[PDB]
Amino acid sequence: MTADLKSLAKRIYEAYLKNFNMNKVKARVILSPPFVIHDMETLCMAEKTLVAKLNKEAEVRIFHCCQCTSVETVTELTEFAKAIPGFANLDLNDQVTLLKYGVYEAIFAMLSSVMNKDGMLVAYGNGFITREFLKSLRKPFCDIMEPKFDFAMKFNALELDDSDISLFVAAIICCGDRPGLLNVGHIEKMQEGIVHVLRLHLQSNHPDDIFLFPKLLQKMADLRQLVTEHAQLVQIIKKTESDAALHPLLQEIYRDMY
């Protein structure tokens, strides 16, 4: 692994630590105290301390808070993408397409860092929602998070650190086979450079697992399918729930996606 490829992996890693408020090391520290949301009583208590200004059904209030975090994460991923060699040199329209299809694959990948089998760290490290509370919400809102917990438990078993995850997220953003891409050839070259660094980095950082790279390629495919199914559930909610309107930035991300 040349000093240049180590520099690329380090640049990506530092751009990850700079652009995302929560990293896996800090998440594990806290998860090892945040306010525990495990029932309706504690949800209301958390709302008054953590999202005071926020009345509708609990399920709808939660859904709105979730939208706020997604808008924030999309903004963070947008600045992170600049660290990827060649991304800023891409056509402005291609940069939008890559981020459009990539953001939620990256969101659910990064969500794993703050999940354990019993729940998830939320609200900038200050809350912890239980997995069972989320399952207790009325349909269809109880169906949103459980497939993400399912993915995260397998993803977390790979025992990646943020030096790996930063490259993985970069690779997700660099997928050349997104619909609507103009300069597909340059994107594939850009993807190839990130994937090449990821492969060498995993060999260096995880010599114990000789299959980690193909394992992560499969997780990228799993995430694409997870996002397809997520978008389908979001469309049902928007259509069936006469009070869960979508933030405009998010509605534009899902527009014409799948």
Ligand X SMILES: CC(C)(Sc1ccc(CCN(CCCCC2CCCCC2)C(=O)NC2CCCCC2)cc1)C(=O)O
The DSSP symbol for 20 reads -
Stretch that binds ligand X, among 5-13, 25-33, 67-75, 201-209 (CB under 6 A): 67-75
Residues 14-33 that bind ligand X (CB under 6 A): 22
Check: CB of residue 191 under 8 Å from CB of residue 101.
no
CA–CA separation, 11 vs 186, rounded Å?
Answer: 20
Residue 124, annotated as binding a ligand: no
Among 9, 83, 107, 195, binds ligand X (CB under 6 A): 107
User: Which contiguous run of DSSP H or E holds residue 36?
Assistant: strand 35-37
Q: How far is the CB of 240 from ligand X (least distance, A)?
A: 13
110 lies in the binding site for ligand X (CB under 6 A) = yes
Closest contact distance (angstroms) between CB of 68 and ligand X is 8
Does the annotation list 70 as a binding residue? yes
Q: How far is the CB of 177 from ligand X (least distance, A)?
A: 22
Assign 197 to helix, strand or coil. Answer: helix
Q: Which of 31, 144, 167, 223 binds ligand X (CB under 6 A)?
A: 144
125 backbone φψ class: left, alpha, beta (φ>0; ψ -120 to 50): left
Residues 6+ apart with CB under 8 A from 115: 121, 148, 149, 152, 153, 156
Residues 6+ apart with CB under 8 A from 52: none
Distances (CA, A) of 201 to 121, 159, 194, 256: 28, 14, 10, 35
The yes or no reply on residue 111 touching ligand X (CB under 6 A) is yes
The answer to whether 12 touches 84, Cβ cutoff 8 Å, is yes
**Among residues 95, 97, 127, 202, the one that binds ligand X under rule CB under 6 A:** 127
Q: Which is nearer to ligand X, 144 or 216 (CB)?
A: 144
Answer yes or no: are the C-beta atoms of 147 and 244 closer than 8 Å: no
Q: Is 97 in the site for ligand X (CB under 6 A)?
A: no
- Cβ proximity to ligand X: between 8 and 70 the closer is 70
Residue span 69-88 as binding mask against ligand X, x where in contact by CB under 6 A, dash where not: xx--x---------------
Distance of closest approach, residue 14 Cβ to ligand X, in angstroms: 18
CA angle (189 as vertex; 184, 192 as ends), nearest 5:
120
Q: Is residue 172 part of the contact set for ligand X (CB under 6 A)? A: no
Q: How many residues are given for the chain?
A: 258
CB of 59 to ligand X, least distance (A): 11
Whether residue 238 contacts residue 43, with contact meaning beta carbons closer than 8 Å, is answered with no
166 binds ligand X (CB under 6 A): no
Binding to ligand X by residue 197, rule CB under 6 A? no
33 close to 94: Cβ distance less than 8 angstroms = no
66 binds ligand X (CB under 6 A): yes
Residues that bind ligand X (CB under 6 A): 22, 37, 46-47, 50-51, 62, 65-67, 69-70, 73, 107, 110-111, 122-123, 127, 129, 144, 234, 250
Query: Residues within the annotated binding site for indeglitazar?
Result: 70, 104, 254
